[model samples]
Target: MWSHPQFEKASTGREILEKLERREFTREVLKEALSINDRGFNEALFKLADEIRRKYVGDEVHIRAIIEFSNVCRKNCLYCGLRRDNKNLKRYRMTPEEIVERARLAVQFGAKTIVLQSGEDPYYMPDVISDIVKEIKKMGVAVTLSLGEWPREYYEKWKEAGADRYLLRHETANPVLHRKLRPDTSFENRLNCLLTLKELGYETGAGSMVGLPGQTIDDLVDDLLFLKEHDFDMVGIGPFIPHPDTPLANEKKGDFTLTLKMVALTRILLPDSNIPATTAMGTIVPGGREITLRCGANVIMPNWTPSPYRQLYQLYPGKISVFEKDTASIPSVMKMIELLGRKPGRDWGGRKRVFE
Candidate 1:
């Protein structure tokens, strides 16, 4: 029998599996699914997740091109190599015109969404980013900004400039662990940024990392509950791979099994939300992304950041970006989707509104 101290909705793993097959969302069942690793139990879970994914979100995997335009950061997050305190790192920032040019190339290469990702660098002010968003929109592709926490006014500026989405990953729901990993920013403030983006009409994304140092299963529970309660358009979860230049350099990498479990569970919980097979998965294990897609994920962000700078923006070590051209990661992704029997998304892959 499987049970959690917090609830008793189902007594056995089979009961919870049956409830999940019926599309029921309960804490006790979630705890059971998250903790159990018996081979048959997980196979059932993954197969059910794939069924739910297909029913709700279909098999079109979105290819969001990421332009890591800057490696400069102001915050001193312990896990990120791009932290400002990393004195050994060489940081670079791309010009606004260059950023838009990269977005154009991404769209031309069949990408429907372009994600402008960076560290918390204030070098490109809100207005500069707003202008870049406007130019990217002209290319007829969805623009997503992943520049970290900022005030409501900054979020408003991006929305006014035609930015369609914002992805600010709240890396953990455990406030204590959140502060420890991201010492410079408060957990409350991180959530408020996501809330503000949602209020400003941006398709907001909230996500978490698995297997951080000192993190517990309860933390993962809270992370999933947060994602469920918020109902964000996107939920991206990935493994934690330590960077050698940071304080967590010696820490062990997040478990691939646990990461896959989280991805499958998140898909089951928010069946319609756009869940990503993160690049970190592929970096940690070969075909990790492919395995994740079979589990439940429906989106894959291929790195389109320019060569030297792409490798330079190392949030975690061993990112799969080794290309010189800004849009070089598309063909491989297209072929991967083809092999997986999924189609590349053609339009702005927005959230589906379920009336039931």
Candidate 2:
């Protein structure tokens, strides 16, 4: 057991960090940590999280190239720009050859992992995805798929076809808020898909959006606990940026400080898991990604999708990218990593413990 000062007083975030350092957790302590507003306390938490990250995952920042293959989604999620109801946005889907060629270029540009991401578009069948995964794997790089909710059969087929990982974010853990944000999509079903992905033998990833509409501190705590309980191999959480075309357009953008706290908390809880300094973080604040890397994040997923189509895959507004020509982006990312006293990861970055 670890000792801490009395939690009965205000400003218990540092005390909570002490508990986290000792690898202990309680709902109330986590709730207190989430509710922390004291700048000094929060900074302490960030430093501790960075220490924990260095101890567990080390200084190799893994780069995963994300190819947003399509913008056509089936659901009308109130917060997403690609929702079926968004008529102002023109939809585009990359051809199978186009996607493979892009992945090939990404590998030549020094990507060790190819992340095939898209909205929940049903146009690409399992075989089509399987073929793409197979081709990419042939380039000696790992492949991760983020095609939204497919059946267990689809997951198994993709796994058999040599896909290595899956990312399916449980946007919000609260059932009511999840339903409100993602209409017609049940929280239970989203969770079921994650569970199924794990069962199908793919290294699974799950995460939530920080500071969502009507989201409470308790909800953020639930999100953290949910990721831990699931034993996710990769975890990503970023601030919720509003899209002007969505129903929640007028809603206030998510608080950057709160989002950073969530990121730090996630690093403390899932120390060995791959946590990306997400592009959304950079969109919310200048140098946000670098700040996150110092706090806990060990992975950075750069946008590798071809132009014009890349701009159209706007799940939210003002997504940041490294756009100094296609090939120059990788070197730029490496230089950024080096300047931060970290090295670019050499291997296919997989979780050491997948099912603990």
Candidate 3:
């Protein structure tokens, strides 16, 4: 039995093996593995992950460039470095022209997709966002939005504007813990927003964090299962790295290896979904991103933002950007794919392949 304080849903190594035999793993397996310090269990999990990865996904990797469009936000989630109370932050928002300019450069860099990520800033209303999406569409570049929760109309507007995909990490599926984490935010509103995105025929991307303060493995399992049930187009998983100013600042950082294991499990459970080896994974451990791709992740996002503000945009602490000056130390993130036996995919430029 797992002996960690958080392992109320204890599961034995034998039980885990049983699940593996069936090609299925319970939420308890995820929780117990994350809770304990057993290298053997983790190694077994990694092997299972690698097996599933090889079976379902071949050696092709999708790459995107996330342009952090704006840093202004109203909701003050406790774990975010860009929270409202983060007076130490330098705020910025790009205009439509600036956004498109960055995207053009991204396309030249061989980016298959351009992700527009921003905080929940009401300043850039639906019309403003739609205009930006339209501009990106004109360039034949695929667009994915990570702007925080908005009304159904806004989602529809962006969809009408030719946006191809939308990503909103539910962060946690447990309502009680979600409420605790995002005190002023509403779970219902976020869910409704996701439903609206799906309704508008956009490729919906939803995900959760790993090892959040007070989070359980049950939360991780629920999130993976939820994505599977919803038939999500994309799923992103990253360890919960705490921000210094947040309420849980001193909380122990998330388990690095367990986070990778969850990524592998996600690949098994949601075979068709586009999974990204998020920078947070690489930031937590060296060579972590390569491990993620080996475990079946098919997407990597290099930064397309101009260098001046790349370091300024911090969703969580210690965010990594491919744009930093010291490019020598960083393996050519794109070239390294060939080295790892994966082909770099061509930019479809928001092609409507999901519907086809």
Candidate 4:
């Protein structure tokens, strides 16, 4: 057993890393660290992880753009803003031509990959997705899809249609807690989907939330072990934000400092996986993105959707919709990289396998 001093007692960045390295963090350590109310330990971990990040990944930040083509969803997850029961959500779906137009604009903005993300709207069937992927590929733009839970046949078809990556957040690995968050969704089914994506040769990205209602540090440790065992190509974990209209709206928002520590721990656990300082993390802290990059994230997602629609696609309350007001212009996002003393990559196209 390793002693994780109370956050206030965390002396230096080096100490945090040494503890992490020596103890080989388990669920108990994560709980102790997360329970500590002070913020120093978290900052120390972030700072040390940032140093490690510079040594390996350098300052190259991979920026991708997300095009929310549709907001209609078949599932009724409790925390989502676009759940079928949520009448407050403004629904919209882009036509094939409209989606392609967004892709073209995203490419022009220096985006190496265009992420086509949306809910699991049954109306947006495989044939439609295949055609959309083909059109994007024809324009020479790389595509990553976040359309939730689809048939295995659909995953194969999309891969065949030139889709480069797939992001499927497991949300939680604790079956009991997962059921509490999403009553209709199955943990095993989600894991199987991840395996299916890997089998189809897509660069697989998987993640879970931190401080989710009823979730313990043990749950997160399980998630980390799962990622280590699965060896995914990409891992994305973000703070759990509460949606006002949702049932859990009263639940506490996730801790930014702890979230940053998790980012550092992720780098140590899965040293080679492509991790991002998610916008959700940034929304909580004024300069959270910078802190996250410093803490070992190597990817950023700039919005490619038109301003009018960008604000309309809210995953959670207080989400920083980068493209909502046309503020996330390509040059600005690029300049953000340069300003941070980092280089932006030209393109990171296709699914490159990282774990054997």
Candidate 5:
């Protein structure tokens, strides 16, 4: 219950929460909401976000088991531990059979979806990834790929192989900042990839990080507006934790409160998009994931990557792995869900669209 010192001077927080309850928002209005720190108003905002999530997406928290099949990345992003320039890091790629076995194991744990995540590693050819998607599809669960930016043909191949969704975090909306943080990558190209994913009929996802070194409230406002403008099916919002070996290692971490507010506002703005209680949030605070689940998030992507290798996929430090030892096991996740008075999702948890 930390309250902003300026809470009572103006009713900005209350006004924004009221408008959100009525399902209304503009960039300026959301920006004002992001600036609020009134304890009661903040609590009210979180409650309304939970209400909207239940109303539009239901209470079944979709468990997406993510298998980090590779840590080798081609890009030298300044904030990632897996960047190509990090020669001190040991890299590994799981064999296709090993990846498929992990997917099978995820399904056995009642995972409604299997999220295959990797850095922008080029080792897995288009056909190789397609085959992995095909095998996971055979398990009768939804498949989502978070392999970083690839060509349109590769996107098409994966979609053809029955890959249902793609998560490519836009990271930030500020073009200058995006370029500075991720060397050799352009914001326009990243957006084009997302557009291509949408055109190929994939359930496309795009999101941004909060609290980068030079990020501003206006920048965050742009992030929220961008997700809505593109009409993404899913969005992953998380705090930016500085990686130890990256250039940002000495910089301050992103604010967890700001991250939570962003999550709440995202729920209000994009009422139906699938949002995850990101592992990064849990890394910063105790019960962070549970707090987000009550605020806006309805998806939990538990790590299913096998040991040793799982430890190597360190995009950020202190990542929360639910499957360290049966982490997101059906019983384990369900226990949390039941404790929160929510239910486990039984069907393949696709994006719950308002139109379709």
Candidate 6:
């Protein structure tokens, strides 16, 4: 944790923090906030974020148990380990019954919501996932779908089947780079999905990656503004970690401080949104998630994907929860919450904050 200085040096960085405290977000100040590299201003920025976090969302750390059901990707994204061209990877998929069974187990493990995540595998048809979504809804826990972009009919069916939320990371705001990194996937396609999710009344989520190769501070500012403008119920910001088999294998890992700065800025801009301490945070630095928890994060996902399959869902290298057993992992997450002076959020963890 960066220590807070009582009286900091007068600079544009400190000025940016001051502007943020007053809830004033201009493009320049936001960019200035993103470029901060000094300790004092960053600490103060984090402190204000924590302050806003406690005021708006209270001290409950919501735990969404994420189940990466399959690693069989159809698209070949250059930065992701699950790309279709990764021939060395062993692909796996769970049956619909098996997915619901895991959801049942996750509910028992104290998960308020079960995040059904997977790469864009074409095997599971629209009806197939709706059945799984329908089955999991009966377990008395919220269901969040993290599958890649699908047809409107799929979202319609899943929403009808009682899916409560959707998380889709836009990855970057620049359309040219978005197309370059994602190949055939269009930036507009991603935006439309989010719009459709919100229109369907599901709690929608959108996020971006920090330190992506060629990502500029101006681009990051656009991302922050995008998150702010959408009024999303949840926002996920994680540092980019290169996968050995992917095209970005040799790219440098995302800067820890820059990632933290982005998270803090997200917190400042959207105080009531559910911001999770991502596993990628811990992958870069062991206590990374804990530090974000102190600074601004109010949500955490302890993996409950179960066994050998868990190790197979490698979106990036060195995933934090890839090794631990459920017995140890669940207790460890519970303990982490208590030690942080926050309680495990009870049910749903819905966005309860009302807008003026």
lDDT of each: 0.88, 0.87, 0.76, 0.78, 0.87, 0.87
lDDT of 2 by residue, 89-171 (tens): 99999999999999999898889999999988888868899999999999999999999888999999999999999999889
- Candidate 6 lDDT over 21-67, as tens digits, reads 88899999898787767788889888998998898888999989888
TM-score of 3: 0.88
Off by over 4 Å in 2: 1-13, 320-328, 354-356
The weakest ten consecutive residues by lDDT in model 2 span: 320-329
RMSD of each: 3.2, 3.6, 4.4, 3.5, 3.9, 4.6
Error of 4 at 114 (Å): 0.6
TM-score of 2: 0.94
- TM-score to native of every candidate shown: 0.94, 0.94, 0.88, 0.90, 0.94, 0.95
- Candidate 1, residues 4-50, lDDT tens digits: the string is 56544334678879888787777776777888867778888889889
Candidate 1 C-alpha error for residue 345, in Å: 0.9
Least accurate 10 contiguous residues by lDDT in model 6: 320-329
How many clashes in candidate 3?
3
| lDDT (tens digit, per residue) of candidate 5 on 33-118 | 88877777778888888888888899888888889999988899888889888887889999999999988987887888999999
Clashes of each: 0, 0, 3, 1, 2, 0
Which candidate has the highest TM-score of all? Answer: 6
Q: How far is candidate 4 from the true structure (C-alpha RMSD, Å)?
A: 3.5
